[PDB]
């Protein structure tokens, strides 16, 4: 039988909302954290990998932050498994819009389109909604530098500094405290990013292997999306030591 | 199992925060009971099968009292080990206790726990 | 049939009692009895409830 | 009012304390309850102490066994729960000591001094039967067809079995009462009981099912036997969805409890000897939600229809309810009846009463036409809505 | 304050005189009692035979017998002889038997049930009447429905036909449904028996239909009466097992209520008062009239009502004359009684942390912004929803 | 879920029997067939005096010559009307004649029972409809009123009323109306039952009346012409 079970996936529950959508948020809590911060001349993503292991080879240097396009970047907060499917959908959407548009993809436009797929599953199809909240960072001309946040609930948000993944309530306040509206420049912002990651992890000690840091900085005529090598992140891990003092002072 | 029987003086002397009961856990057939018995023949000391089968209900207030008896004989009859194979009906999660028999099963559990703190 | 000794063919739908742990103690009394009066093979019947 | 409440609180506390001492102290102050007429009885009372036949112990005769060797042997159960066998009463009839009969036996000699009135053999069956009132047809709305069948099926064969012989059938063993609730079925049932001069014994199905099943089995059998002793009776089983629900047994649910109690009742329906002129009346929502297994249609006989009042049908109940009541009105019974939607009889009956409560609000003491008009509008909404579960998904 | 005080001082002193006057009556002062009653007692105790073995008097037979059940464990068919009459004995009471040979000596003592002791709680509301104002219209209704058919027969007798048999108090908590039951009960002084709905579903099965019938039957014996069934949402909500949840358990309890209230067994002018915070759990048959009669609905507090609801909470605490009521109506509205209780508690909580031992406007204001947010937060906000 | 294939041993669906109870809470509709027209009456459900009777209707056009007044659950009525409207307009291009009142009622009647717990498609359902519709219009066979119900049966009626009490509203209509009579007496007969079954009483923004004569188009009544029909209740 199948008629004697509950899981209230497409069916509304006594709550007025589905179980499956609310549960997805719990899975996101105990998985590696992703934050995006705003700078005056770029935007950046910093993420904690889902690997708590002490030995990584770096086969794929995108295990949390994947650069979709030469105009965009994403992070994963949640399960790496649902991310894999989503990553492939993103390389196509991000480039398709660009073929037509010939202008760096708007951060808002991308998320609302994606959020529509996240909600489609929970409402119909009898599939659960993806266990992944994707943190999009990008730049378009008519909003400026942007950060947008994606949920499994189909909720979107326009942010300037936010964090999703593990211990999110603490994390967004911590980004607000150090970094106000429009305050901090790109280089000093990369430091800030590591400082919050050190504090908030599923399992302590922040290392090069556990972190991946990505920059969107607009270069001479092109907006350049790079994922920093382990070597560069390390220079930021010492910078993050310097940053702890600096927030306090 | 072995160390307090052979030489309690050593146990006393170190200073420790003692546990009440000690728990052995694994899946069944993993040799947990087997092994506790195995050491008991090697030590040379009495053993007592203490289980819900030993405890007798037929009058109200006889059940908890039986628990005290086993504990008082064990302490008298050192060296020994009391081993409980299944505390699977000595302790249950439901106590209805609007029935005389059900009311004794709850009492039996209470007494196990209080004598065990002393032991 | 072949052996012809003392037998306890123990139905287990009458060891049971209204009080708890009286039925356990009871089965035990039968095991002791069988030992006194060897040879014995004890046939346990209907153990889908004992 | 914070400062004002403390003052009052302290003053009561002190007065209250002092009271405890006065009450205890006074007492009845070494008086005797009996007064003057019991003084003669004291002297008797002393003679009895010397006597061996006093005090008697009440017991009950459980079983009749003959291996007679003095005078007839009976096994009784003493209330210390030792079984003892006693013998035929010292002078009273053997026809007064029966199975399931109470007897007084001596405390010191244990022989039957005198038999006593029968029955105390179950503890539970005695508890399950409750008080009996009578309400009459006046009070119960409608003189309709639905009302008329209840009388004809129950009243006529029990009152005169002669009529039922004439036709060439037996007076029903079984009788079925059906109709949705909130129609005054119980009320109608009370009303025929007085006319027939047939005792009705009310019973609740919810007492019958219990945690361990078997109590409900012995109870049901004992209950039929008691009724069988009574002549031209009705055992009315009210509010049953145990002996009343669906036929099905899960085999780890409370459904086990239902199935034992139903199963004995089937045995009782046929009987150890048949039940000509004995009626069991059973109330169900409708006969299609009753067992095809407990319903073995020849025995059950007629199924008496009661149905949810119609718009015409409710026009009729409302005149009875209104007329019975003391009311001063200008507006008519039909208007207000059409005013109500098809829902239940119960909303429309409450209008008659609510108009009286509006009169106290209005600062009258008896109703008026305006109170009546106010009552329909609030009542239709109130009772119907703000109720019922908001799910019929994933049930068996 | 000063106006009250002269009378208060005098009342305590009048009561003192009353206590002291009792002592002189028991010790020295006698006229009918004398040495004579002392001897009557001795003489009666020795004939009667101490110890007296307790019995319970179920019923009296007029021929010089009674049917007694001795409380030791085995019942006896005694004679009514020695210091009592048939009429002097009363049913459902404890009686004295001569120990040597049981004849019923008499009734001095009454027998209380074991059940009733636990159930019962004393009648009186901690918020005085006309200060449970706020839905003031509604408070009046219960006094009319449960209290009045017992208090005043005049309207009912002229009105004719059946009286009321209950009320159902429903809607969001904090509108004081418990305080109302207690008021009417206080006034009439009808024995107030109180059981929480959760007692109806406990581990043992069939306890629910059992407790409810016994509770009512005891109310009829100790009648007139008010039975309060507090918070019947539990029936479905709770389960200790599969048998304790589910349809059998829910039905049996509902079914019992239907027969008990208006059905065959009926009840007297004994009223049942039900508190429920959800009639979602409750059926259309116990929301049916003529075993509930007028139902009282409390809606969410209105903007003007909310100021009167807030005053009640403020009266239990320290009395405000410095709280701005408008700020509370502006910030939140069409939220429960329970929300007004939530603003009050949080103010008290911040003051506690300093070791400030009062609440003022400042404590209410500081706590008020967090509480409104908190109300929304109580229901899940997830990750970011 | 809990059975949606549910038959009683008599041989009808429980679910269909459940469908009527929903109609009873909803709106009230009267359709009367006259020789001289069809008049349709429906409850507007006032509850503010700000709701405009000319701007909003619940007498709606199937065709420019055919009307339908709805009762019971409002959402359910809309789904039946939108499929029926297209069927009707498509019919008009093809035949070049107005659609019989019976012809449209048969199409909607198919939807009422086809439910089942699983294997559902748009042509099927998860639970049967609890609306009864009064399709009134004038065709070439004359003015007809056909009645469609929740059981998905079509019947010719010269008077039907369905509402708060379906059978109740029809019993009032059985006392008053006579088969062959003038337009004013049919319009009067529709209003009269309507106020008595309802909690709500007769006004000119309380109810909506529109009349279709043969040889006329469907006309939804003006503010003034709605008020004229109110004088004779």
PDB file of C-alpha atoms in Angstrom, chain B residues 49 53-55 57 101 104-105, chain C residues 18-22 24-25 28:
ATOM      1  CA  UNK B  49      21.187 -15.548  37.635  1.00  0.00           C
ATOM      2  CA  UNK B  53      11.966 -15.040  36.507  1.00  0.00           C
ATOM      3  CA  UNK B  54      13.480 -15.143  39.970  1.00  0.00           C
ATOM      4  CA  UNK B  55      11.060 -12.262  41.065  1.00  0.00           C
ATOM      5  CA  UNK B  57       4.278 -11.692  42.297  1.00  0.00           C
ATOM      6  CA  UNK B 101      -0.232  -7.064  38.991  1.00  0.00           C
ATOM      7  CA  UNK B 104       3.961  -4.550  41.354  1.00  0.00           C
ATOM      8  CA  UNK B 105       6.014  -4.356  38.095  1.00  0.00           C
TER       9      UNK B 105
ATOM     10  CA  UNK C  18      -2.837 -13.388  35.953  1.00  0.00           C
ATOM     11  CA  UNK C  19       0.239 -12.261  38.095  1.00  0.00           C
ATOM     12  CA  UNK C  20       3.604 -11.582  36.419  1.00  0.00           C
ATOM     13  CA  UNK C  21       6.761 -13.643  37.288  1.00  0.00           C
ATOM     14  CA  UNK C  22       4.557 -16.459  38.935  1.00  0.00           C
ATOM     15  CA  UNK C  24       8.264 -17.889  35.031  1.00  0.00           C
ATOM     16  CA  UNK C  25       8.913 -19.389  38.410  1.00  0.00           C
ATOM     17  CA  UNK C  28      11.323 -23.663  36.577  1.00  0.00           C
TER      18      UNK C  28
END
